[PDB]
Design a protein around this ligand. Structure first.
Ligand code: HEM
Ligand SMILES: CCCCCCCN1CCC[C@H]1C(=O)N[C@@H](Cc1ccccc1)C(=O)O
Ligand SMILES: C=Cc1ccccc1
Length: 455
């Protein structure tokens, strides 16, 4: 029953590459999937991959005995500054499992309890900023969510204060990082990346890479000279020993991990919080239900770890926002051996797949006809969701190591926003999704009305 899979329009020797010559490539690929269906071939000079959009096929792709994590071109470009950090290493590189073993305890329950007070520190700064706005000023939502999540990973993970709420402009790090990500996206469609037309891109790229590495220097310097006794992510990087190899991380890999966690540890969580607030102001009945939970649970001026764990509906709200707009919108796999996908598509060892997560999460055979609706109650019973239908944090041993960090932070912060403010979509905002490999609303603004509840 071997089927021929469709393929979108080609451009001679450039094959499908020019389809990525857009500022919204993921959304363009979603439109192609809409037209071609659950699987389509995508070619570029010297490369082939297959975009998967159905749970039927993705549940097979998530079989770790058959498929391993692949570095997409995007991750290969990010590797130019993230090296063999956790997110851009191959599973078979020694430094992947070594750093995984060393850093997994930094995301245990007991670790999350230790981060909680510092996430409250940053969350309170956010609430205080909004309490201090004048009448009919508004909130720049992704901007402030990025302030919050960057500051949280800086403080919680590295005892470093980016002090983003003391800046009306993005931190130097954010500016360079967003620019490096821009360059990585745009480089995806460059057919001649060594054409001298991109000499300045190359120079600017190196400049943004040095900005990010300079902050890494300072984080490392302050820690090793500090006289305070810390027990955080950086402590584990500098002191942890891998049970298997017996070795700690070396200095080069530590630097890559700091870069990795500063980027991965904030950018996707700011997108999640932005999309979540978007859906809440567009769905006031949902906002009300989550606000009622927040008021009933968050009975103290400062939320506790235990209280955040009881914000179960807020948790469902976040999962439903990750369903509709997963902020790291794709991951890539390669076939470990010859194998046949879905009884219809034979693959040879080494063949690559692209999992298009926003399209998977719109599979009507899984979610029903109301798939575009925002209904957190979809997540009331994880046993009623088929396997691998919901993959916002990737798959298997290469799934997101920061999943609990992100969800604790976002649950805490959204709980506090709903406790302390009513929100108004005063511009009737039209969703506009900016792509920087990751996804985030652009230009989303709201007004908050304080409930005047003291901190
Ligand atoms: C809602 C927020 C987040 C989302 C949606 C998300 C999503 C993902 C996805 C889909 C992957 C797999 C990438 C692949 O297969 O190529 C991943 C990997 C990873 N994420 Fe996240 N992430 C989030 C937050 C975080 C945070 C806060 C951190 C750090 C604290 C983090 C650290 C990582 C790391 C290190 C990896 C690589 C894991 C490994 O392969 O060992 N993420 N994330
Ligand atoms: C935080 C998430 C980072 C990883 C997700 C990046 C996901 N890409 C972000 C932009 C679009 C999307 C993607 O489909 N990329 C492919 C593009 C590609 C396919 C075939 C040949 C050449 C290039 C890739 O990078 O290989
Ligand atoms: C998980 C990898 C990643 C890569 C770039 C930005 C955010 C996350």
């Amino acid at each position: 029953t071997i089927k021929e899979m469709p393929q979108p329009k080609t451009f001679g020797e450039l094959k499908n590459l020019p389809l990525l010559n857009t500022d919204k490539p993921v959304q363009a690929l979603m439109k192609i999937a809409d037209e071609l269906g659950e699987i389509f071939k995508f070619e570029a000079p010297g490369r082939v991959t297959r975009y998967l959009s159905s749970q039927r096929l993705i549940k097979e792709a998530c079989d770790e005995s058959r498929f391993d994590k692949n570095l997409s071109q995007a991750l290969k470009f990010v590797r130019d500054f993230a090296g063999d950090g956790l997110a851009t290493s191959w599973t078979h590189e020694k430094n992947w499992k070594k750093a995984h073993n060393i850093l997994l305890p930094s995301f245990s329950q007991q670790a999350m309890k230790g981060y909680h007070a510092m996430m409250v520190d940053i969350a309170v700064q956010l609430v205080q900023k909004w309490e201090r706005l004048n009448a009919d000023e508004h909130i720049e939502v992704p901007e402030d969510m990025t302030r919050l999540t960057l500051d949280t990973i800086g403080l919680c993970g590295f005892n470093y204060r980016f002090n983003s709420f003391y800046r009306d402009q993005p931190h130097p790090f954010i500016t360079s990082m967003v620019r490096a990500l821009d360059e990585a996206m745009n480089k995806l469609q460059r057919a001649n990346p060594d054409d001298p037309a991109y000499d300045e891109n190359k120079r600017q790229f190196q400049e943004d890479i040095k900005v990010m590495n300079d902050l890494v220097d300072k984080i490392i310097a302050d820690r090793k000279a500090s006289g305070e006794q810390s027990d955080d992510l950086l402590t584990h990087m500098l002191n942890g020993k891998d049970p298997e190899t017996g070795e700690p991380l070396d200095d080069e890999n530590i630097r890559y991990q700091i870069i990795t966690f500063l980027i991965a540890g904030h950018e996707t969580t700011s997108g999640l919080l932005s999309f979540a607030l978007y859906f809440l102001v567009k769905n006031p009945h949902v906002l009300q239900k989550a606000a009622e939970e927040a008021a009933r649970v968050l009975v103290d001026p400062v939320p506790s770890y235990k209280q955040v764990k009881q914000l179960k509906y807020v948790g469902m709200v976040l999962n439903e926002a990750l369903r509709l707009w997963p902020t790291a919108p794709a991951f890539s796999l390669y076939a470990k051996e010859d194998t046949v996908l879905g009884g219809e598509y034979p693959l040879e060892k080494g063949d690559e797949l692209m999992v298009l997560i926003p399209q998977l999460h719109r599979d009507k055979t899984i979610w029903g006809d109301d798939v575009e609706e925002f209904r957190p109650e979809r997540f009331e019973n994880p046993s009623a969701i088929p396997q691998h239908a919901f993959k916002p944090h990737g798959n298997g041993q290469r799934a997101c190591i920061g999943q609990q960090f992100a969800l604790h932070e976002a649950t805490l912060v959204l709980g506090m926003m709903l406790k302390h403010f009513d929100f108004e979509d005063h511009t009737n905002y039209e969703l506009d999704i900016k792509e920087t490999l990751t996804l985030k609303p652009e230009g989303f603004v709201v007004k908050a009305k304080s409930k005047k509840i003291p901190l």
